[PDB]
Design a protein around this ligand. Structure first.
Ligand SMILES: Clc1nc2ccccc2[nH]1
Ligand SMILES: Clc1nc2ccccc2[nH]1
Ligand SMILES: Clc1nc2ccccc2[nH]1
Lengths: 293, 293, 293, 293, 293, 293
C-alpha cells in the first residue's frame, strides 16, 4: 500500500537482481503444483494467477498441476455418498471417481483457468483424457502391512511429451487436473503431488515448485533451528521415514523429479503472497531447494 | 450381424457412392450438435463417437457441441438445490451455474471425449473459458410479454475464430461445453443449439448438423404427408411460429447458421445408429436440409 | 441401379465397417499396380480412377504403377517394326524402346491421368527420367539355360525416395510409367510388376496391391478348393515353381515387397468393379494377402 | 577448341560483363520456346540443355515450351493415317491428337528431359493434363474468309499459376508439351508459340525467349539493312501484316506476351550454339528485343 | 548492498507491480537512445547493458541507438585535424566523416556490444551501410538566418523496416551507429537523437526512450515547480522555442516519433542507475512522458 | 574496352565453360581472404566487390575475411603511439588493440561493405564480438627460441557455426574483421590469414581462396620453372620451412584448412583484375591449388 515510501533506487535494484533468474528460466518449462491455502484464500489465489501470467509474459513456460482433496470429500457428503475405508484410505468406486473428476476438472480447474485468464488468453484446462495426453496405471496401497486395492486410483504411466510441449509452445498455460485413462480406457484419479513430479520429469522441466502450507523442510520438527534451505536427494531420501505424514508426498515428489533429472525441486510456503515470484526471482526465498546427489 | 449375406458387389457400390460427399467435405469444418437419445443410449453414443473418428480419418474436421439439460437438473435435485422459476424458466443463480458447468464440462463432455478417444488421440474438451476461445453476452427472456432476467444465461458473443481453427488443424476434435465468460469475466451457460449455430458461422463450417429425436421437419404435424426433406430459410422462417416448442430452438439455429453463410444446416434423426454417416455420405438421409433463400 | 431398395440401416453398417481400415491407412502410402482388363474396359477403368480419388479424399496416398505390354506390341505392328526373339522374349532395340516409351508414357499413362483428373487436380505422370526419380540396371534373361541379352530392359535400381514423397505430400497421385535411365543415362523399359514392388519398398508403403485377371492364388490350379486367401512368404516362395507362367511375376513382386518390409501385398481380381475399394475397406475381398514369415 | 590461346584477362572481362544480367534475372522466371534446328541438331540440342542447367545453377528459373510439328507429321505417315485439309490446315481428328500427344509428350519432350538431366535432377515433363496445370479452349481458323473447325486444336485458356510456380520453386525445370483439356476434359493440341506467350504471361516471366531459324526481325525482307534489334509493340503490331508466314506466329507471341506485361520478349537465332547464353548474358546478341509501347 | 534488510514481502510487491508493463511490452519494439553520462560512467554503462539483457530475457525487443559527439571531437584533436566552423557547427569534410564513422562504429558501438554480450549472444552492431538497412538525405543548417552546407551530415531517409525486424525476431539486439549512405552511396553522419525517432517510427516501436542528463522537462527552467511528468505533443510543440539548446534535439525527437504514431516517447534521467528499468516497470519514474494530442 | 572486336561465338564458349564450376559451387560456402594490393588499388577493389556480387547472384555463398596490417600501423603513427617490439613483433597493448579494432572494423571493413553494397543489399560487417560469433584464444610467439607474450593477439578459438550460416542463408555476405573476445570477454586481434582458415573449416566451406601479391607458389624461388599449380598437403607441409617469410602465413592457412576437410585451398594473384572469377570459373587460373594428401 504505502509502498511508494520506498526510494526508487531500491525498487530498481530489486528488479535488477531478478536478471540472473530471468536468464536461467528464459524459454524453459516450470511445473508448479498448486494446492493448500494458496488455493483457498482469494488474495493468494489472485496472486498465484498473476504470477503465472508474469512467467508467461517473461517467455517462461509454466505448467500448473492442481489437487483438491477436501473439495471432493465435501461434494461426496453433499451427494450423500457413503465412503468405504480400507486403512485410512477411501475406496474409489466408479461413483467416487465420477465425482472426483467432475469436482477437479469442472470446478477446481475452472476457477484457476478464469483467474489466470483475467490477464489474457493463457490458461487451458485438461486431463490425461484430452488428446491422450497421459495415461495412468492402477496403484495398490500397503496398509498395516498388506498391499490392498482401493479402487480407481493410480500413478501417471506415460506422458505425451511431444503433444504437451506443442501446447506450451503455442503460448498456453496448461492447468492440469490429474485424471487419466489406463490402457483399457478406464479413468483413474492420480495424486497431484506425484503427478506433478512425473510431468516435470517428462517435460524436461527446469524447476518443479511444490506449494505447501509450511516454511520449508524441518529435519527435527519442531526444532526451529532444524529448518534447512538446500538439501541433496541422498540426504533427503534417508530423512523421509522420519517426517510428518503431510510432508512425505511432497518429499517423494521432489526426490522422484530430481532423480529423474529435473535440476531442482522446491518446497515453498504457499501462505506467502507471490511465493512463486519470491522463490524464482529473489534470493530471499523461504522454501527448501532439492538438488541431485 | 448377418450382413455378410449381402453380395460384395453392392458393398462396393455403397462405398463408391460416398465419393462426391468425401470430395465436398474434404478439408472442411463440420459442426455437429450432439444431444437427445443419441447421448443417452450406449449403442448410439458409441456409433456417434465412431463417426467423429470416421470424419477425422477422412481429413474432415468435425467440431462437437453438446448440451445436457436433463443431467443438470438431476444433479440439482441430488444436491437439494431448490429452483426459482420465472415463466417456465429456472433462474440461473451463481450456484446453479457452478453445477451446470461442473456437469456439462466435468461429466457430460468427459464421456464423449473418452468414447471418441477410444479410436485415437482426437478429442479435446473445452469451454469458452479456455484460451478465451469465445465469450458470452447475458440474455434476457420474454415471458407472457415482458423481458425478464433469469440469471447467468446468455448467447455466444465473439468467437476466437483463429485459435479455434489452429486447434482443428492440429488434428483435434473439439468437444465443446457451452459456458463462456462475458466481458467482465463472469461465466454464463449458453443454450447448446444456438451455440452450435454461432460456432458453425464463426468457423466457416461447410455443414451444421443438429441431432434431434424426430424424423425431420413436419410442416403440419402430425400429418405424415407433411414431412419435408429440403426447405429454404425464407419458407422456414415464416413456418417457425407454428411448430412444437421442442422444434423451435433447432430451427432458429439452422436459420441463423444458414443466413450467416453456412451452406447447409441439417436436422437429422439422432435415434438412428450412425445417423451422421447416413446424412453425410448417403442420399438416403431421413433428415431435412436447410439452404439459403 | 435399384440399390435404393436396400434399407438405409445396412448402408450405414457398410460405411461404419470401413473405419478400422480408414485408421490403418490414414496418412500412408499405398502402391497399386494397374493392368489387365481393369485397364481395357471403360467401366472398370472409370471405377479404378474413382477409387484413386477416393483414397486421396481420405487422406491416403496412392501411387499408381502401370504396364501396357499388349499396346506396345500393337503399335510395333502398326509401325511395321519386325521383332527379334531370343527364347520367347522380344529383343528391345533402341527403336523398340522409343516405341515402348512413347506408348506407355504418351498414351497409356495419359488416359489414366485424365480419368483420375476428372475428379480433381490429382494425377501427375512420370517416368524415372523425370527429376531423376529412379534409375534402372540392365537385366539379362536366362533362356533354356543360358543368360542372354535382350536389349534395353532392366530392373529398378535406385529410387529417389525423398523426392517421390514430396510429390505425394503435395497431394499428387503419381502415375508411373516404368522407364528409367541407367547410370550412363540410357533409358530402359522395366517390367511393371517388379517396378511396383521396388517402389512400394522404397516408399515404405503400407500395402502393395496387384490388379490381375484371376480370383486369387490357387495352389493346385485348377482345383477350386485350392484357392487361398492369406499366405506367408515362406510358404509362397516355395510354391512359386509350380504356378502358371502368368502368375509368377505377380508372386515375385509380392515376395520381394513383403520381404522388403512392406506389411502386406495383395493379389486382387481386377475384373471386379471397385476391386480396390473392396480389398481395402471390406472383409469380403476376393484376393489373397501375403504377409512376412 | 584452341580457345586457350585467348588471354585470360579477356576471359575475365567476358565473365564480369555478365553481372548486370545475372542481377536482373536472379530469382526470376524465364520462359523459353524451343523449336527449329536448335531441336534437330545434336550439338545445338546439347548446348541448349546445358544453358538451361546454367540458368538453374545461377538461381534463375527457366521454363521450356517445345513444339514438334514435323515429327507429328512423320509419325502420321508412318502409321498410314491419311490427313484431311481445310485450307492449308490438317484437321485434328481424335486419332491425330492421340498421335500428336504421344509424339510430343512421349518422344520429343523425353529427349529434352534426358539431355537436361545429364547435368542434374532438374527436368520434369508435363502437359496441361498433369495436376490440371492448364486448360485449353477450342480454336477455329479463318480460311480464305470463313471461320472453320479443324478439330481438337486450341489456345491456352487458364493456367494454374500457383501450382506452376511451386514446381519451379522446388528447383525443377518444367518441360512443357502443349496439350491440355478443355472444360469438358477433352484434350486439345495447342500451338507451341502461342502457348509460350500465355505461360510467360501467367507466370509473371521476366523474359520470353523464342528460338527460331533466322537472325532476327527483318522489316523489309530481304533487305539486309532492314534488320532491327529493338522494336516496340506499337510499331511491331502494325508491321505484322507484311512479314513471311513463318514469322507471324512468333511475332504474335511476343506481342501478346509483352502487352500482357512481360517486360521483354526476344526473337533469337536458334542456329547459334548457346544462343540463350549470348542473348541473356552478353550485349552481342543477334536477336531482336520487343518492349511495350 | 544492505538491501537484504528489506522484508521479502515488499521485494515481492515490487516485482508483482511490474506485471502490467510486462504485458504491455511483451513482443514489442522499444527503441532506446543511449548517450550522456549513462555512456561515460562504468557503473551506469554496465547497468544499461544489463537492462537491455533484462528486456530481451522478457521477450521484449530493444533497439539501441547511440551517439558519441565528444569522442569524435577528441579523436579529431588527437589526429591534429583542424576544424572549419560555419555558425557553431563543424563542417563534416570527407576526412571528418571517416573519423566519425571509425569512432562511432569501431570504438563506441563496440564497447556497448561487449557489455551487453557479457550476458549472452545478443548484441549486434550496425550502420545504415550494412545490408542497406537505412539511407540518409543530406541536411542543410540555417545559421543566423541562411541555410548553409556543413558537409556530409544528414537525416535518416528510408529505413529497411522488413530487414530490421527480421534481425530483432532472430533475438538480436541491434546497436546502431548512425551513419548511412545517401542515394549515390556516399556516407553521411546522422544526429543520433533524430535517428532514434526515425527508427522508432519505422519499426512501429511501442516506446521511444531518450536517455539524457536531466530529471525531465522543465517548462520554466529553472523553477523547480515547473517540472512536468506527462505532456501532449500539441502543448510540447509550442513550448519548444523556449527551452535550453541542449533540450531541443531531444524534444524534436519525441515530437516527431509520437506524431509518427509511436504511442509514447520518454525523456528520462540517464544519471540514474537502471533508469530503463525504473521507467518501464515502475510508476516512480523521474522522466516525462510525451503522448499524442 | 575494344572487347567487342571478339567474335560472339567465343564469348559464348567462355560463358559455357563456367558451367561445371557453377554446378560444383551452387549452394556452397566459399571463404575469401582479401588483402594486399587487391585492397589498395581502386580498380582491383571494385572488381573484387563485383565478383562477390557475382557469386551471390549465382546462388553461391561467399564469406570475406580481411586484414589491414599497414593501415593499423599508419594510424598508430598518426596518433603518436610509440610501439614496443619483442623480436620483430609489435606488442599489442590495450591501446594498440582499440586502434586495431577501430581501423579494421570502422574503416577497412566499411569500405568493402560499401563497395559490395553498390550492387545490392548484400554486405554486412562483423567481428567475433557480434552475437558472440566466434571467440579467440591468446597466442604466444616464439622469438629467437623462447615463447613470449606480445599482448592481446590470438587465434580463433570456437566459431558459432550455426549462427554464421543463418546469416549467409539469409542472402548476406559477411565481411569479417578478425577481432574476437576470449573466454573472459577481453578482445584480441587475430591474424587474418589464420582466421580465414579457421572460418573456412568451421563453415564447411567448399573452397578457401587466399588473395596474395604473387603468381603462386614457387618451390625454389626465384627459379621461374619452379612454380607449381597443384600441390598436396603432405608435399606442401614439408616445403614450408624453405619459403619466404611473406608466404608462410598463407601456406599454413591452406594446410590447416585442407587438413581440416576443406576440399581445396587456393593461393591466387590478387594483382589480377577479377582474379576470383578467373580462379573459380576458368581453367586458366594463375594460382596454385592445395588438396589433401
Ligand atoms: Cl488439449 C488443448 N486444449 C486446448 C484449448 C485451446 C487451444 C489449444 C488446446 N489444446
Ligand atoms: Cl515430377 C512432377 N511432375 C509434376 C507436375 C505438377 C506438380 C508437381 C510435379 N512433379
Ligand atoms: Cl551479425 C548480423 N548483422 C546483420 C545486419 C543485417 C542483417 C543481419 C545481420 N546479422
Amino acid at each position: 500500500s504505502r509502498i511508494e515510501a520506498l526510494p526508487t533506487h531500491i525498487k530498481a535494484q530489486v528488479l535488477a537482481e531478478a536478471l540472473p533468474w530471468l536468464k536461467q528460466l528464459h524459454g524453459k518449462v516450470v511445473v508448479v503444483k498448486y494446492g493448500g491455502n494458496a488455493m483457498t484464500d482469494d488474495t493468494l489465489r489472485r496472486a498465484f494467477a498473476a504470477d503465472m501470467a508474469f512467467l508467461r509474459n517473461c517467455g517462461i513456460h509454466p505448467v500448473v498441476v492442481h489437487g483438491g482433496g477436501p473439495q471432493i470429500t465435501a461434494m461426496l457428503r453433499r451427494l450423500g455418498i457413503e465412503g468405504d475405508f480400507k486403512g485410512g484410505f477411501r475406496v474409489t468406486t466408479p461413483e467416487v471417481l465420477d465425482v472426483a473428476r467432475m469436482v477437479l476438472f469442472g470446478q477446481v480447474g475452472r476457477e484457476l483457468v478464469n483467474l489466470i485468464n483475467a490477464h489474457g488468453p493463457y490458461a487451458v484446462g485438461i486431463t490425461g483424457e484430452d488428446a491422450q495426453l497421459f495415461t495412468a496405471v492402477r496403484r495398490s496401497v500397503t496398509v498395516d502391512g498388506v498391499a490392498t486395492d482401493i479402487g480407481l486410483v493410480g500413478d501417471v504411466d506415460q506422458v505425451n511429451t511431444a503433444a504437451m510441449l506443442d501446447l506450451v509452445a503455442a503460448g498456453r498455460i496448461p492447468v492440469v487436473s490429474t485424471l487419466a485413462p489406463d490402457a483399457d480406457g478406464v479413468v483413474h484419479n492420480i495424486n497431484a503431488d506425484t503427478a506433478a513430479a512425473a510431468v516435470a520429469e517428462a517435460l524436461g522441466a527446469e524447476k518443479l515448485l511444490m506449494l505447501t502450507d509450511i516454511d520449508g523442510l524441518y529435519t527435527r520438527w519442531p526444532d526451529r533451528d532444524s529448518l534447512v534451505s538446500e538439501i541433496d536427494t541422498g540426504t533427503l531420501a534417508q530423512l523421509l521415514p522420519t517426517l510428518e505424514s503431510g510432508m512425505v508426498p511432497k518429499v517423494e515428489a521432489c526426490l522422484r523429479a530430481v532423480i529423474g533429472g529435473v535440476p531442482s525441486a522446491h518446497i515453498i510456503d504457499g501462505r506467502v503472497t507471490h511465493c512463486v515470484l519470491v522463490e524464482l526471482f529473489t534470493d530471499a526465498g523461504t522454501g527448501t531447494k532439492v538438488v541431485r546427489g
